[model samples]
Target: SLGAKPFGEKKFIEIKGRRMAYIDEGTGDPILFQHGNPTSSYLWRNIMPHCAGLGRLIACDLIGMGDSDKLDPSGPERYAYAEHRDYLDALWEALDLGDRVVLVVHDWGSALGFDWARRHRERVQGIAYMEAIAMPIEWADFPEQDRDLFQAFRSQAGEELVLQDNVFVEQVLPGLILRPLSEAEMAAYREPFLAAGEARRPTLSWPRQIPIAGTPADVVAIARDYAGWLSESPIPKLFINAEPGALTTGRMRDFCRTWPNQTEITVAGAHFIQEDSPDEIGAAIAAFVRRLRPA
Candidate 1:
């Protein structure tokens, strides 16, 4: 309930014959926000206001998640990484987001944002990211305890843990956020997939898309391509690292440090840093956006 007021209004647009839901605020250069699996624009509720006056802020629900359209369960590729990309790319065109765009993203959202930035190099003004899937990783790169958990996520048990039990909302989210979410906040997180069954397909599909050991060749290629672009891009970049984060840990943390034109900030948080340090995150992003404005 605390962070609920600002994000009450949601808008929808048609993309590729499906309804995509989003929240839009402010006006100026576009500051597009992208969220990862089991999350929607709701993830940015507390964080978006900080960037509101600096630009037109829009955060969208990824296709098949949040209030967006869900796919009928068809095959292994039904809600795979590529499908998400296809939908997101179309949303960009539908929204008419053009030059001088800034991106604030996390998790798989960073992967998609970076991929889009590379494809449209002149459009992105800057990026601020955390807990990003920035590069392809090996099994050893995963935290020891999490390695086994994710192995099961990629295995047969994922359906039981993710789809049937809705563990991402019920278990994993609370555990990773480091602070207790209000009952209302938790309920909002659960609202998307409350029905269970196919409702949780996007959540289940996300882990399997992790670019580990090069198994998901397309995702790994996306990660690899973005990594190269990130290293070379001259646009301003921010890496908001949370202490001992799930994805951006070990080698990935080091890799993040080496990216050109990047500024790294440490925040006391876990994976979902916005939940734990919204004020600090907000302040940092606002300052970054202001600096991007031409004097």
Candidate 2:
């Protein structure tokens, strides 16, 4: 099957009239890996094989990112955090994926994944989250420098900076990980932002989507709902925190403490832990899953 060569295989699921790109491979139980910010399903390239043999691995490119259909930013309808969640819902429903699932998410996917989980808790079996935001409590934990940077990036002025400055393609994406990326990998990340202002949808919207101090009322509301879900859900969970370049370092541990059955491990990497330390992440996930399964 397509499981032999998972890379570069393009498949799409129609969600709300948009053809969203996704790669479905292997068989057995299902493990869906959802990416966030800048990178798409491409983020899973190095780790997909590690989990493919264990079960089906599906990764999708969010709309306006990666190979998915791009949207008109100037149009009345723009990509909102809630809209992203809805797109994921429609994608799952379209595929008819059953309730029993293993969700692997990172970055913005954390919020999006948890949002979906809150709505359909019974469908989720377990979650393997890495360097992700889990609660509004974590927002207050950001350092002053990071907070200022985030605030600047989240404003209407920030939208202009991203579209006009090309900061994401030139500076942000390249330095996301601890180790330097190869030329090919660097190209892959830059490929999505071909046009000057193409990165606006993700680079600008991601920071703005963060719920800070009950501001941006809608995001704050969603954060409250997601925070409640994190505390209340009894699902098995594992969190991998990157030592450096993570906004939610100590905060992730605090958030995990509220869960019924959760494990937290620290890995040496930057924000993109998967890219920087795939072996450590892969080993951790494999061990966690093994512990959860009945003998």
Candidate 3:
């Protein structure tokens, strides 16, 4: 198992009327982990144990996913990427995490994490990214076929198809890793969306939130600024790219160039690098953090 015996400690906070769950283990400077879409803080299970002694590792479930409270799909203020950003902001403030925090992000977490870092750069001392959007230098990097597929899925009419289909859990999620998931582990990913209605907010809203070519959505603008900040910031940054995951390949090297202090590595795994290669991922993170700290 990726975690230590008892798997550290679990804690919760009432943020914005929702009970958000997080794992808080060990104690030192803070190392905050942010997960991407579909998966919650559970995504960090495999990698958390290794870093327990280095610092306080905090991994939280995003609203509408994981163990957090679900939002109403029909509500005007329903969960979306923009709203998710705000949710995290409140989480940080409520937790009282001071400046000099290390941010570990994956998948959709890349965008959300970077946006927060841009707004509070002084609070973020270092970053370790896996399969997340960082610099937007590769918007044209996506293949035409995949790009078109995503565009069609983002259309309003495709919302129902996305919510009802098990493809995300059965195919997309599993395919991201080179290793196979156990039956129980796989079930964890599918459990949150057991109901068709529960799937509407995350499944349908994520694609629609992609900010391509200045579509003018708030998230798009945030993404644009994030890319610029990443290019200009002097903070230490590390990118972990898993082979066979088209989203992170070929572009990470270029993306790292935007940062004044950055490093990148290609690991043998899938989109969910931690699940597929926990040891490698964990070691890489430890090494990056060590390098960032004084000798």
Candidate 4:
């Protein structure tokens, strides 16, 4: 209830015969929030209130991940990165979100947001991101301890860890945040995948899809394209870095520092900064969104 209450009523939009769940709040330019694996629009419960009146806040669950409709497993897509993108693209067209759109993103959400902004350059007002897949990550970029774990996620062991055991929500999600999550919060995170089996496929798909060492060539290419746009785009950009972050660290952090028209702020957090520092993250995004508006 803590997670769902602040987001207000749940809304659904049909795409490709499947229902996509989202939250639409406030009333102004659209400030779209995109979440990564093992998270839903519920991830923004604390953060959204901070930006409530600043814009028309919209946060959607990636297809098959949260309250959104699950894909027919018999079909060809298998919830791959491209399949997720296809649904997101369709959602964008269906919503008809006009120009002056601000994006608040994290992890794979950043990748999806960047990819969306790449083609719809004229519509993006600003971007506020943390723990983002900002570029093609080499194996060396991952922390040594995490390297083996991620590799296992791409291997046969991943099925047992992610799907059968529900380790992504049980272990991985909790480990990323600096502070402990309440029982209520953790319950909310676990709510979506209680069905197990096919429900856990998207979690497994994301780990393997991460473009490490150029293996997933398609995603690596998309990262490259978005990174290019990120570097050149004159729009307002906010880099919300966490202390020793998951993906947004080391060489990736250095690369982001060089981008033009950007503001970098480091908060006391690990990867899932929202859980640890929601107020700070939300305030920073609210300020950035305010600045983007006409004075």
**Most accurate candidate by lDDT:** 4
Residue range 1-295, candidate 4, lDDT tens digits: 1243546777899999999989898898899999998898888888888886788989999998879988876222388889999999999788768998999999889999999998899999888989999999889997665788889988888888887898888888998887778788888888888876878888888888898999789999999999988988898899999886777889999999888899888887777878877888888998898889855
Clashes of 3: 1
TM-score of 3: 0.90
For residues 220-251, write the lDDT of model 2, one tens digit per residue: 78868877877877899987777774656666
Candidate 1: TM-score? 0.96
> lDDT of each prediction vs. the true structure?
0.85, 0.73, 0.73, 0.85
Q: Candidate 3's error at 226, in angstroms?
A: 1.0
Looking at model 2, residue 6 earns an lDDT score of 33
Q: What lDDT is reached at residue 271 by model 1? A: 79
Clashes of each: 0, 0, 1, 0
Candidate 3, residue 243: Cα displacement in angstroms equals 1.8
Query: What's each prediction's TM-score?
Result: 0.96, 0.90, 0.90, 0.96
**Residue range 1-295, candidate 1, lDDT tens digits:** 1375436478899988889998888878898988997788888888887776788899999998888988875445678888999999988888888799999999989989989989998898999999998899999987676677788889989889988898877877887888888888888788889986887888888989999999889889889999987988888998888886777888999898988888778887777777888877877888888889854
Instruction: List where candidate 3 sits over 4 angstroms from the true fold.
Output: 1-9, 73-77, 136-139, 143-145, 251-253
Which pairs of residues have clashing backbones in candidate 3?
Answer: 176-271
Residue pairs with backbone overlap in model 4: none
